[PDB]
Amino acid sequence: VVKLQIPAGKANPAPPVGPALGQAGVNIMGFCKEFNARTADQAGLIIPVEISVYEDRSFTFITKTPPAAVLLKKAAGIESGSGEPNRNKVATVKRDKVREIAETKMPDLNAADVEAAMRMVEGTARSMGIVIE
Amino acid sequence: KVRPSVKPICEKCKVIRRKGKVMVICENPKHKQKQG
Amino acid sequence: AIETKKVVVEEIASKLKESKSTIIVDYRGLNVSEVTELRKQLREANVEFKVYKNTMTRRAVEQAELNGLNDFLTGPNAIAFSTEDVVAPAKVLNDFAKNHEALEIKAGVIEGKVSTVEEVKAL
Amino acid sequence: SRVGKKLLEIPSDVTVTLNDNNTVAVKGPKGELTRTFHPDMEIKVEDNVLTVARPSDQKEHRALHGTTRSLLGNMVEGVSKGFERGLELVGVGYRASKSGNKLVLNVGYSHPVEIVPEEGIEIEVPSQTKVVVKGTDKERVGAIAANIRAVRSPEPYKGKGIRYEGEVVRRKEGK
Amino acid sequence: MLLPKRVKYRREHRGKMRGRAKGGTEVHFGEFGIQALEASWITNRQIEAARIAMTRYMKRGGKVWIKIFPSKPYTAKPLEVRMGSGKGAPEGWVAVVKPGKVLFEISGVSEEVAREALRLASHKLPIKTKFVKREEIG
RNA sequence: AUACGUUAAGUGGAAAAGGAUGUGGAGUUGCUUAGACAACCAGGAUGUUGGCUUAGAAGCAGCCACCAUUUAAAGAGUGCG
């Protein structure tokens, strides 16, 4: 099992994929069409993909959401957070806005509940130093 | 090594007297020591 | 020892309203194997199900002194008790059985628990 | 919480004589042993169960009492199941083969290596890599295992010569 | 490195130490402090050797306390000079020390760090010493 | 010689700072048959390396807000890597 961050819009050249999965016995030609299929809904983003390795050289893949807290910069409206969080509260975000963010992360999050999904994001918003309001 | 004031250096080290002479022993060979 | 009483009195409250339960051996209890079961609890309900591996004969068996007096035989060796709150019984007896058959933790050949006054044979 | 108070069952068939003072002549199909015992210790034979008891709680007695049980358990098992210690040779041209009771060792020294087992001990060579020293005496099998190890002290830089199976020799980076 | 701005006399008698300390036996300015078991002379350089050892290990923290300011000179006749022909000169300074006296104090520091800072000072000081804490009956 | 002990090195019959599961007594305290120290079999966190960074270094360049959930349990980290 070797996780990789294959881009959604492209999958063919050796240097990003190539030998690294080619030594796994993976048939690269047969899967590249698949990476361009389901990920087309979210083109232009770098989508991480888990890769299990069956003994029969069969394969099944699971796509994931773009990485967490990147969205927090957008909701804050600021390009970058403080280098000194809490000591420097550069930005603030409403609790209702956090609800919009947590729902996007649900397939990636292992959180049992939406109320718990809130608390997970709350630990990320504090990393940016952003106040929770 | 041999010094009058043998002391533990890491948690893996253990103090064990042998033949009337205290010796500290560890999984790392460098930490091995004996007093006297 | 006051903390131990919280371990006792709380679990008894579940057993008084408990409906069904199943034996689960603790051997080779991989964390990934647990998550596969925990997700099933999320479908059946929420936090209402309990995994609590407080399976000492000095612990859980004392809870069984009030009700479910069939745990005395199951008490030796590893156990993973489960308790139901609401949820009409069905899949709960079946879901864990499917897991052990595909590797992941010995089932103990299902020693069985309270349902009537019996033991072995999940339905 | 203690060593010698524990009972030792005899699976059988292992008889145990109680001859003074004190000699314990354990007997059976595999062999016999006579461990030395100072008088202060008290050995007794429950039916198919050896027993040991401490005369006092004094610190000197506390040490000796835990040793006497561990030895007797080593004795009975060697009279029954027996014992063996593997030795994993590692290298390229290294190999070993018997020549009579003697065990020739083609160690990398230009001088040929030979080791003669003591009576009651034999060394089969199922493969050139593995080495097995069968014997009823743990003190002797471990001694012979050390004597064979003496022929080649292991090199931390590379797996060579005698090596216990299994054991991790410390890794070293050459340059 | 601590020396008096002025002294009434260039030289003084070496004296004769005896008995329990006249005072300062009980630490209170600091949460913890070194306490000598015996009595012996301490040169000014020995005091500086102790404080430098603590400031590094302590890092950020409360100010180091020093209850003892040296005042008694130790005479040092130049080498190979014959006996007599006048008293020598004060090469340096030495504080008087008595058993049970609080040689140093530390405060505002965590319990783990405090155990070490008192220990490193004990090596620089020839006198045997022991760990001490404030009493509050009180 | 008698009685209660202590000492194991020839200490007794040669010093020190310092070091040590040496041993004999005394005291205090944590846990502990609603379970202790040893184990031997179980698993190791979830988003996540998480913010600020250094090409990248995800338990770990190092500076830290070092969060909250899954819960029988685990620090967004004890350590060999």
Automatic annotation (TrEMBL), chain A:
InterPro entries: Ribosomal_uL11, Ribosomal_uL11_bac-typ, Ribosomal_uL11_C, Ribosomal_uL11_C_sf, Ribosomal_uL11_CS, Ribosomal_uL11_N, Ribosomal_uL11_N_sf. Residues 64-132 form the Large ribosomal subunit protein uL11 C-terminal domain. The keyword Ribosomal protein applies. GO terms for biological process: translation. CDD domains: Ribosomal_L11 (cd00349). One or more lysine residues are methylated. Part of the ribosomal stalk of the 50S ribosomal subunit. Interacts with L10 and the large rRNA to form the base of the stalk. L10 forms an elongated spine to which L12 dimers bind in a sequential fashion forming a multimeric L10(L12)X complex. PANTHER family: 60S RIBOSOMAL PROTEIN L12, LARGE RIBOSOMAL SUBUNIT PROTEIN UL11M. This is Large ribosomal subunit protein uL11.
TrEMBL record, chain B:
One of its GO terms (cellular component) is cytoplasm. GO terms for molecular function: structural constituent of ribosome. GO terms for biological process: translation. It comes from the Bacteria. Pfam families: Ribosomal_L36 (PF00444). The keyword Ribonucleoprotein applies. Keywords: Ribonucleoprotein, Ribosomal protein. HAMAP family: Ribosomal_bL36. PANTHER family: 50S RIBOSOMAL PROTEIN L36, CHLOROPLASTIC, LARGE RIBOSOMAL SUBUNIT PROTEIN BL36C. Belongs to the bacterial ribosomal protein bL36 family. This is Large ribosomal subunit protein bL36. It comes from Bacillus subtilis subsp. subtilis. The lineage of its organism: Bacteria, Bacillati, Bacillota, Bacilli, Bacillales. The gene is rpmJ.
From TrEMBL, chain C:
Belongs to the universal ribosomal protein uL10 family. Part of the ribosomal stalk of the 50S ribosomal subunit. The N-terminus interacts with L11 and the large rRNA to form the base of the stalk. The C-terminus forms an elongated spine to which L12 dimers bind in a sequential fashion forming a multimeric L10(L12)X complex. One of its GO terms (cellular component) is large ribosomal subunit. One of its GO terms (molecular function) is large ribosomal subunit rRNA binding. The chain holds residues 4 to 126 of 166 of the full protein. Keywords: Ribonucleoprotein, Ribosomal protein, RNA-binding, rRNA-binding. GO terms for biological process: translation. Transmembrane segments: none annotated. Forms part of the ribosomal stalk, playing a central role in the interaction of the ribosome with GTP-bound translation factors. This is Large ribosomal subunit protein uL10. It comes from Bacillus subtilis.
TrEMBL record, chain E:
CDD domains: Ribosomal_L16_L10e. GO terms for molecular function: rRNA binding; structural constituent of ribosome; tRNA binding. GO terms for cellular component: cytosolic large ribosomal subunit. One of its GO terms (biological process) is translation. It holds the Pfam family Ribosomal_L16. Keywords: Ribonucleoprotein, Ribosomal protein, RNA-binding, rRNA-binding, tRNA-binding. PROSITE patterns: RIBOSOMAL_L16_1 (PS00586), RIBOSOMAL_L16_2 (PS00701). The keyword Oxidoreductase does not apply. The keyword Metal-binding does not apply. NCBIfam families: rplP_bact. Part of the 50S ribosomal subunit. PANTHER family: 50S/60S RIBOSOMAL PROTEIN L16, LARGE RIBOSOMAL SUBUNIT PROTEIN UL16M. Binds 23S rRNA and is also seen to make contacts with the A and possibly P site tRNAs. Belongs to the universal ribosomal protein uL16 family. This is Large ribosomal subunit protein uL16. It comes from Bacillus subtilis.
